Design an enzyme around this catalytic site. Structure first.
Site, PDB file in Angstrom:
ATOM      1  N   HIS A  41       0.839  -1.227   0.000  1.00 31.35           N
ATOM      2  CA  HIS A  41       0.000   0.000   0.000  1.00 31.35           C
ATOM      3  C   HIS A  41       0.868   1.269   0.000  1.00 31.35           C
ATOM      4  O   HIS A  41       0.293   2.349  -0.181  1.00 31.35           O
ATOM      5  CB  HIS A  41      -1.089  -0.047   1.072  1.00 31.35           C
ATOM      6  CG  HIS A  41      -0.693   0.126   2.501  1.00 31.35           C
ATOM      7  ND1 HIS A  41      -0.184   1.309   3.006  1.00 31.35           N
ATOM      8  CD2 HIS A  41      -0.891  -0.683   3.569  1.00 31.35           C
ATOM      9  CE1 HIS A  41      -0.017   1.199   4.317  1.00 31.35           C
ATOM     10  NE2 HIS A  41      -0.453  -0.014   4.688  1.00 31.35           N
ATOM     11  N   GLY A 143       2.916   6.110  10.583  1.00 28.80           N
ATOM     12  CA  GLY A 143       4.329   5.821  10.249  1.00 28.80           C
ATOM     13  C   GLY A 143       4.785   4.440  10.706  1.00 28.80           C
ATOM     14  O   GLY A 143       5.927   4.064  10.382  1.00 28.80           O
ATOM     15  N   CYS A 145       3.468   1.388   9.876  1.00 30.40           N
ATOM     16  CA  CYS A 145       3.294   0.336   8.846  1.00 30.40           C
ATOM     17  C   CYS A 145       4.676  -0.180   8.437  1.00 30.40           C
ATOM     18  O   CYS A 145       5.638   0.645   8.285  1.00 30.40           O
ATOM     19  CB  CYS A 145       2.530   0.839   7.625  1.00 30.40           C
ATOM     20  SG  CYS A 145       0.868   1.439   8.028  1.00 30.40           S
TER      21      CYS A 145
END
Ligand SMILES: COc1c(F)c(F)cc(C(=O)O)c1F
Ligand SMILES: COc1c(F)c(F)cc(C(=O)O)c1F
Ligand SMILES: [Cl-]
Ligand SMILES: [Cl-]
Ligand code: NA
Lengths: 301, 301
Positions: A41, A143, A145
């Site tokens: 993503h 932040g 991920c």
């Protein structure tokens, strides 16, 4: 003596964490040999996340669209490929700090250490259980991920989790390191909720053994029971069924304390029915279900 | 979102841990530049447990009585001296993995990460607080002596604890890295016991501010209290006195939530009077006192 929620030492993993940027999106990557793993993503703008076509968005991009930074060093991206929900970026340089590792998928009830990271920088470490509903109860901010979950067996790091998203209830969802989601979740901004959760019955019994090993024994009783009998009480309290596999994994702890699992199930039976009667077990007012039998044996001997 | 007992990434500390042996006694040591720090009771033998005369036992040792080991490497000790209850062993090599470090003595209520180690090998990492009675509630088996507590604020490792012993109640006592004990404890096997422990009031309030940031408001009330009335009620539940310093330190959390410190204090008074009535706060059925105002702002929005 003493008993604490304890993460694995996180240095072997800190040495693998890099920052990945694609357009406006920054998040974390895992750098092992000559490949950087991160969530797919990262290639999406906000608009894209409402209904992303990852095949189409991806073939559009090129290697120089990905900024990979290991501390204050740019890595050169020479290849990019998708595997399920995980993006793989080949780089000109193998990680000189790569540990002995494999990719593993964990079962619900099993624990792992999470190395929470921001802009590629390790921030903190904590233990999590893969819930029966395939969420984890993490602590993640924007932040995070690409933060990863792992176990250590001797010198080998087994990577089991990569962080992808937070759900509306404040619980967290991600993939194994092969891009397969844990639970019925997708990497798109749509309406998603955690199933109703259950208590990990065998972990609560492991934790009660930990209490006893540490001189906390009030909840004990002369009584014993049966699987059938206990499981009827279990299902009533949204507890996972207790199987003969669970009873066999608890064998060591039943030995070391001289309390049989159904002996202990008798104690747990009465705790669910009667409550804790204003007392605590190992400094908790709750029945803790995020310690596996392994966790208890490992920490207590 | 989410809120977790979260430890610092332990990697910078892992590359400092060694094994120190003297006589038949093996424990952990901390290798920074060309110095290894360990507890001085490593030089004690079977009889020297009750009233060791450390100056007498040390003067009888040469550098070659100390067997120091960084994994497979045998370091050569070239010098030795005592600072309070810590032994400082000089070696012919600086540690190549020595990070930016410093020694700080902490006050009660302060939190740190513990890297539990056996035979110089890290076993796990967890968060502790220095209790008002100057003990920590750790997880330590035989061989853990020399394990250290630390913070990592802005890439610098502040060392604040070295583990020396377990007290009869199952709690843990040790020194700063200048070898001075926290509390009135001594490195002798003479009968010692910790003072009555108290709840860390400032930390409970910080955690209640954390609950509100994460969207929980059920425990708030329309009331306020004076600082004095709060302290008269709080000391009847074995809570530490709240000082003006504590009130100031909460100012930023008060600001972010729009709840005055003395308002939150009225909420705490009420929770102590009612209990939780089958509800939980950030996944606890108890009032947690091992998160500081600093820890709450680090982990939260
Ligand atoms: C002779 O009495 C002592 C003594 F004072 C002591 F500190 C330790 C021992 C021991 O052998 O463990 C002992 F026998
Ligand atoms: C595990 O060794 C011990 C021990 F048994 C003990 F009673 C005390 C100390 C100490 O440092 O005060 C110690 F290191
Ligand atoms: Cl798609
Ligand atoms: Cl402090
Ligand atoms: Na029983």
């Amino acid at each position: 003596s003493g008993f604490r929620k304890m993460a694995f030492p996180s240095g072997k993993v800190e040495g693998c964490m890099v920052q990945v940027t694609c357009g406006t999106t920054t998040l974390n990557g895992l750098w092992l040999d000559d490949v950087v793993y991160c969530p797919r993503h990262v290639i999406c703008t906000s608009e894209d996340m409402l209904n992303p076509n990852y095949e189409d968005l991806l073939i559009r991009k090129s290697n120089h669209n990905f900024l990979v930074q290991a501390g204050n060093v740019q890595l050169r991206v020479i290849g990019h490929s998708m595997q399920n929900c995980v993006l793989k970026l080949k780089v000109d340089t193998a990680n000189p700090k790569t540990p002995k590792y494999k990719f593993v998928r964990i079962q619900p009830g099993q624990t792992f250490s999470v190395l929470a990271c921001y802009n590629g920088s390790p921030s903190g470490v904590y233990q999590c259980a893969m819930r029966p509903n395939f969420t984890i109860k993490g602590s993640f901010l924007n932040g995070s991920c690409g933060s990863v979950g792992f176990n250590i067996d001797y010198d080998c790091v087994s990577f089991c989790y990569m962080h992808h998203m937070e759900l509306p209830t404040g619980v967290h969802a991600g993939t194994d390191l092969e891009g397969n989601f844990y639970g019925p979740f997708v990497d798109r901004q749509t309406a998603q909720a955690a199933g109703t959760d259950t208590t990990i019955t065998v972990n609560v019994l492991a934790w009660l053994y930990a209490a006893v090993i540490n001189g906390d024994r009030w909840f004990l009783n002369r009584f014993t029971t049966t699987l059938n009998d206990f499981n009827l009480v279990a299902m009533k309290y949204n507890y996972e069924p207790l199987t003969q596999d669970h009873v066999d994994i608890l064998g060591p702890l039943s030995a070391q304390t001289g309390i049989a699992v159904l002996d202990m199930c008798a104690s747990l039976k009465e705790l669910l029915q009667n409550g804790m009667n204003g007392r605590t077990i190992l400094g908790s007012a709750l029945l803790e279900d995020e310690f596996t039998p392994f966790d208890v044996v490992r920490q207590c001997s």
